[model samples]
Target: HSESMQALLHEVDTFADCDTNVLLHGETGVGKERIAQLLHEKHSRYRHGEFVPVNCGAIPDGLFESLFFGHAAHKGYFEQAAGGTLFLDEVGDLPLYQQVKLLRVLEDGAVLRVGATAPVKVDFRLVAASNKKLPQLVKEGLFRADLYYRLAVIELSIPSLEERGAVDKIALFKSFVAQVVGEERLAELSDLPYWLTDSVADSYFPGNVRELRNLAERVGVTVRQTGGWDAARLQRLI
Candidate 1:
């Protein structure tokens, strides 16, 4: 983790035992899900339960109800997340109709299945993510104010790659490179060429950690093909 990442984790640790809903604010690919995982790992009450993840942007509008609330044949995300953390990634993409349903579930603390007569009591902590600015969304009337207030009991905004500083950029580059390539290859690339470090530290990474990881994989591939990561090969990537 970079210095800013560690600081962010520290901020998360302070609320680990709070047992309230959390909202992660960051650009796409800025490690929001990883921070959610860290929060689940440190949560005092909900650590034993599964860390269930749902991509709000991936679910279809027609299937949102059955998939989220459950069907007679299968359990929904809420039931599956009972006694655990339910991570709603990219929640800004959740449709307005779906947002009403989610707000009901959060308010009632229960799930009403499609064919069920009574509400099924569910206890799960909510941790939501959004790449979009939620307050602005609320102002624009795209997001609901009540649901926003409910989910954002503790809001944590993550710094983008550009804001993480030069040291962090170089550190993340080396770390991801080591993780992607074998130790021997990393050893060969040890004390990474100053040009490579400088290139990564000063580069524009609109894709954040995801982009960094991809670049590291490219570096590894180039090294394997050319027998080393030369200045020319690194230049081609940056």
Candidate 2:
């Protein structure tokens, strides 16, 4: 409904240019992963390469280095994604020791399998996402300053869904609806008012795009389970 939404779409359309490292900074549930996916999709090398995602914050301390670098049974994300993009989601959550190892890999362009002796070369792009402020953590002595600087050569802060433009919201909603209910079902909800749509455009969606998709799925399921899309059926779903 507004021009800002169109501008957001344009940014999403061409987010893959490899100028330097990317640091996707945003609040929780701001669709950081979706932006990362878009970046991978637009990159030429990633067109055919294995697109991998690693939850850095979720990586336990016991398995951090072995997981990012490599291990006995599996190649760490770096080794496995030799020429592709390795998305490190919530990287701010990585422990200090793990951050040190990650810094080594990023600086040296090499990796050492957990139980191996040699460091293997790597030519992968690093796309790190975080919902927290690494600099603040560094100041508080929780995260490493050097590692934060290394991963933040090109920071790209994204707004929460509540701050994004309306048209972008509707477009995303449409795509999400189509994925869950097919094109025919999407048509049924096409008459959603621009204002109702805009109101939620920048809604600070708690679960990001994943939550939105889930909501779409619930709507579809409710309609199907009830044999109609009515207030009573929707209420039952809630």
Candidate 3:
């Protein structure tokens, strides 16, 4: 982790220890989910229960209610996440109707399963993430203003790879390289290849860590084929 990452981690440490809902705002691939997991693990109150993750955009509109609130004997995301953290990824994509249901839970601190009249009390921390501009969405009437305020109680905006500075990018590049070719082998590489160093330091990774990881994996495969780091050959791979 670089200075920026350390700062973000510190924010997570402070916010995760509390019950206030956190909303992570940033571009896609900025490690929002990773932070959410860290929050769940770091929280003293949620250590006993599992960390549940749900992609709001991936869930179909028709199944939103049943999936999030449960049906019959099945346990929904909320019920399953009782006493833990429920990470709602791409929360900006949640439908208006589903937003109301979610708001009810946040307001009442209870979960009402489908076909159930009485609400089931639940204790869980909510952490939401979105790539889109949520406040803008609210102004445009695409998202609920009330729900936005509740979710953004402790809003944290994550900087993109470029915004985090060159050091962080280089550090991430090295880290990804270590992941691709064991840390033990990292010693042999000494430092990043000239091509990779120049490319990483100069370029902006739109896909952030995911793109860097893909580049590192490609380098690993190419190194195995040629038995060495060839700057000229590697430059094209960038």
Candidate 4:
């Protein structure tokens, strides 16, 4: 692991012990869920309950509202995550209507159900992740400023794979190879002519780490199936 990654992880463990909200900023498939899971698993008080990760963009608008405020007497996702963790994945995609609703619960520490009159108290550690630059959205009135302030009590900018330093990329590339193929004999296939991962580090990976693993999986078979080859052949797999 790179020093930056290790440093970020240290803060994650440290944050887990405290009762505070954490906002993670990064691109898609760049391990936001990985960081979120580490926080949930490392938590002291919140771990006793459950960790619920909801992708805002994926859920249909009607279902998203239903998840937030249940129909009639049914419990919602918020209530289900009481005394636990609620990971708001892709926090950027939330429509303005839901944004106001979310801010209400976050501020009041309670939820007023969709069809009910009484407000229900809810408690949980909120950890939000965003693929977009939220401050920019705030400027456009797309995201609520009050909501952003509450969620960002502790904020972290998760760097892309490219920014994580050179050796880190090569290391993960080799590590992925081992995991995808077989660590034992993959050595025969790849300690990789020394220049291999160096060359890998130089290229572009738009999908970041997930892209690396997919390439490794492709290389796993392509190389093994065809036996040893030069830089030209290996690059083809990538």
Q: Over the stretch 1-238, how does candidate 4's per-residue lDDT look in tens digits?
A: 8877888887886777777899998877778888887887788888888888889888787687678877666778788789888899988899988888899888889987778888889998899999888989999999989888888888877778888877888888878777766766766654576666766888777888888878777776766667754567777675
Largest TM-score belongs to which candidate? 1
C-alpha TM-score for every candidate: 0.92, 0.83, 0.90, 0.85
Question: How many pairs of residues collide in each model?
Answer: 0, 5, 0, 0
Note the residue pairs that clash in candidate 2. Answer: 70-76, 161-202, 162-202, 162-203, 162-204
Candidate 2: where is the Cα deviation over 4 Å? Answer: 1-15, 165-171, 185-204, 236-238
Question: Which ranges of candidate 4 are over 4 A from the true structure?
Answer: 72-75, 112-119, 187-190, 221-234
The lDDT for every candidate, in the order shown, is 0.87, 0.71, 0.84, 0.81
- For model 2, residues 146-228, the per-residue Cα lDDT tens digits are 98888887667777555665566667776765666667765765454444345446555677666666666776666555545
Alpha-carbon deviation at 13 in model 3, angstroms: 2.6
TM-score ranking, high to low: 1, 3, 4, 2
TM-score winner between 3 and 4, please give it. Answer: 3
Q: Could you give the C-alpha RMSD of every candidate to the true structure, in order shown?
A: 1.9, 3.2, 2.1, 2.8
Which sequence of candidate numbers ranks them by lDDT, best first? 1, 3, 4, 2
Clashing pairs in 3: none
Of 1 and 3, the candidate ahead on lDDT is 1
**Per-residue accuracy of model 1 over 106-169 as CA lDDT, tens digit each:** 9889998878888899998899999998989999989999999999889898999998988888
